[PDB]
Symmetry: D2
């Protein structure tokens, strides 16, 4: 079967979500399917706030950050009774399946829907690059460029004043963004959650650099590891060089998607449709060793471990 499908964006927004939706809509249409766009992820589902999507409703969207459909958190969705009101709207709208774009929270919702007879496909949308079974997630590369662009500006100013700059990068519990940024910006030190942090190894590395004539030091550090103001104070004390802490924040979440994002989103969206049409349900799409793959949601969540990019850390240390 499957005549009509639903699409939503749930969880934290990431550049390339619009490309993904377009990817879905255009794929669907071409295959003679009808498409409903659901507002504010799962909440919109619950409240029955939807719209009919044609090919033009996804035009002028490919090079746009955010999610035109909106995103929202709806913890309640974990309650089967809430999902019962959800399913009724589905029947009542004649939706046969959905494509969900989000993180792991979103994939769980989607698993719940599948066992209730509404096959769902999950696509990775997040700048954190922390979803299992994918080398990359949509929004990663866009954030990477925002961060590096920031580090470039900081180098200019840091040089001018022979300063040390600490930069707090997003990623929550994943150091991928930090680490990649650090290589690309030629940072002097990197602090990621996956490695034990030694304030001491840091100090030594900075002084060694200073002894070598380095005019500036740039420290890349993942958020939630310490208070960057405290850390800046500590460095200034112990090194005699004025330190300045910078917290990029939410700028990392916005802006026009980079080509990698535009293209990954596009390809993923199209593969979503092909999956539904071949009868799959409760799968999460991913990109592994440059190949598009699909896994059972439960399998990916409970059975896969997020590998540590050790080879990139080794490389980082050699180019200091």
């Amino acid at each position: 079967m499957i005549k009509k499908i639903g699409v939503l964006t749930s969880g934290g927004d990431a550049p390339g979500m619009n490309a993904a939706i377009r990817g879905v809509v255009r794929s669907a249409l071409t295959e003679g399917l009808e498409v409903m766009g659901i507002y504010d992820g799962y909440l919109g589902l619950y409240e029955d706030r939807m719209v009919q999507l044609d090919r033009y409703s996804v035009s002028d969207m490919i090079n746009r950050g955010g999610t035109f459909l909106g995103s929202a958190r709806f913890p309640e969705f974990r309650d089967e009774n809430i999902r019962a009101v959800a399913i009724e709207n589905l029947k009542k709208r004649g939706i046969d399946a959905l494509v969900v774009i989000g993180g792991d929270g979103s994939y769980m919702g989607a698993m719940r829907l599948t066992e209730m007879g509404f096959p769902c496909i999950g696509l990775p949308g997040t700048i954190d690059n922390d979803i299992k079974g994918t080398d990359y997630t949509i929004g990663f590369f866009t954030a990477l460029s925002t961060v590096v662009e920031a580090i470039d500006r900081l180098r200019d100013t840091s040089s001018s004043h022979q300063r040390i700059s600490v930069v707090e990068v997003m990623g929550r519990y994943c150091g991928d963004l930090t680490l990649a940024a650090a290589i690309a910006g030629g940072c002097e030190f990197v602090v990621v959650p996956e490695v034990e942090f030694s304030r001491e190894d840091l100090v030594n590395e900075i002084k060694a650099g200073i002894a070598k004539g380095k005019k500036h030091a740039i420290v890349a550090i993942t958020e939630h590891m310490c208070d960057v103001d405290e850390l800046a104070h500590f460095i200034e004390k112990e090194t005699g060089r004025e330190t300045r802490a910078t917290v990029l924040g939410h700028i990392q979440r916005g802006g026009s998607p980079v080509p990698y994002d535009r293209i990954l989103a596009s390809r993923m969206g199209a593969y979503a449709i092909d999956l539904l049409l071949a009868g799959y349900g409760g799968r999460c799409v991913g990109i592994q060793n440059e190949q598009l793959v699909h896994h059972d949601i439960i399998d990916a969540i409970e059975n896969m471990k997020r590998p540590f990019k050790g080879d990139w850390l080794d490389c980082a240390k050699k180019l200091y």
Copy 2:
């Protein structure tokens, strides 16, 4: 007289400084003069740290941020005895005049040295836009782009989530940055130090916005006015909408100068030399109503005044 001139960068670095230097060196060379570059602003002047500059030393500098001579904050320059040393260094090297590129603070140093008999020329180099006698200062336009770009990015994320975003802008005690940025980013409310700040008006304006169906709200505020974190929480409580505070910081000070900065800097550089060959000293260059102008330093510091830009603000409120 006047066969050899000196040139330094003082105070907070600003994009376009390299362009100003290049302006100076190239003009001077063409007029048969010799140029000495003083390192680390007033610190290298005191420590007698200088190098000779040829036409090639300013090559590949026009599109770079920072200052290759370095800059410093040497508060001790306030002492008339330290300035005594600096002047001796100047005479020993055979230097006839000095070209100082910096902010309001650097203008004071230049003034003090003029008062001592050493002829200087001040060029407005600061992202802040706070020097008297000039519509703009080198680096303003560049920082304006860094900021506006940041804002374009926050509009995307706060829209996807129906959030309120508080952006803290540099400027110190000047609102130009914050104000030009709020109009260019189409901000909901602007808070500057030249106008009385009313938590009331802010909440009321925002609420109004929500009534009319605005998906996001961007509030642009000058630094040192409050705790954006405290202010953020306060907004969240009073409106029921999630709020996020972003502190741009030091990214505003770096990066490749925008066209305007590159050009202004070059023009002021060439003009400095013209003034020198004419026999003027103790003067500062500015751009006034599209005209390259010079004033007695003393006149600018003391008896000039900052124009209340009700003009930009009345327009700002109209477009909300």
Copy 3:
């Protein structure tokens, strides 16, 4: 009187046209006026293709290139009989006046409408910076940045191979864009329509540069002056250095507007409304010596001469 007004964009598009329209709409609304948006400039007028514009129809437009209303050429409009069908649509729609955003072609149309009892205000929209009675036009600064961004990339590649690069810049019969670009990119030679071109002065300047150790030469040249392929061949022959010609083209017309554009458009749009309300008609808005001014359209067109930016050319030559 005046209860309702019309707005259109005519002639070649330029970044910041959307900011201008927003500027008008929001200003109008705030003043209790109603607003019609006319499609494809004057053609749309003729054919009666309009829409009602509210405050939301101009949202998410400020940072967007192009004109959402469209532009189109309609030479026929010069015929009074065509204008008669135009006026009937106006009456029939109850439009009392219009704000026209374009070039001088557009201003003439607008003059015609005024004498026929429908007061029109003209705003400068064009990357050429060639409208009389304005220091700048909307779109100029955005193009300037696109060109300089291009020149920066060309320097990198030119250096690597010790090449000469000729870059053809837009501007039609005005060298403002070329000249500004040349200073900002540190070009070795500039060719603008306003100055007699000597292939010889060019060759000499290039060899002198080459004799001096210059690793690259960048030549900035305004379009319609020669065939850049022919000119590249000529340079290669006479200098022994491989030459490459680059024609930027239409990339110059697009992209997100720079802050200067966002703000000039905004201010101009708002001033348009104030003019209509004070009873003026048949005026063209401009920015002169940092002041917003208005002139009689005929006066501006037939009586003002486009000044030559001689002071910028003098400066260009000194920094070679």
Copy 4:
């Protein structure tokens, strides 16, 4: 053995080359080796033009385009006698191995030198993406952004005017650039050299587009396939819609490397040295399915093959 290595950049410059060099120099230093930088690719090798490189010579290079050692197209390197001279220069300087960074052509030189007994290592440096045994080459991603950005800009102008835009992309005999660009810019039609070009299909697709109400149409075509000017006129006649051809040119080759290039380059650089210390020679590094890999040069040049990317193209047509 192996105490001193050499490093050069050959062929068409590519953004990330500076990053590759830095990769090499920094790794080598760390392993106790000595590094010689050869100027102007195979030309300086022949003329024996070299410099010693320390850790500081590669500082401030990571974010810059081009190559600071220079590059050259020295066709004469084809002569076995010229290569005889080059090898003598190498032995006289005490150099044990060579690291060559260039394209398909440079790989031939490296191969010929290996054949003569001098051990080399090839690193894929070219915007084209045409080397066998690597998914990507240094500079590809950067040129992809230069292009996509160009396209975002043309969408704005061609939309305001209901125009068709023909964009000519670099690549030589490889379609990757053109193809990735067409999907990322949401192009209407793509013309590449790996597929048969049908003027018919093109007009028919475009006409289709107009039927469905498309305001613009962007056609992305690889260079050396036709005369975009001729093709432009042909389209204009057959569709009644104004067409414009834009030739991106050399802007594609320059500018600051994107994050991906910066990182890949660093990683390949470090890897070269590892291979050297292991005793391998006559090898070339590539990135295959996210893995750093090495192959016998000979194997890559001769018996490897280019993968028909029907995959990207089938998806391209789906999203139109």
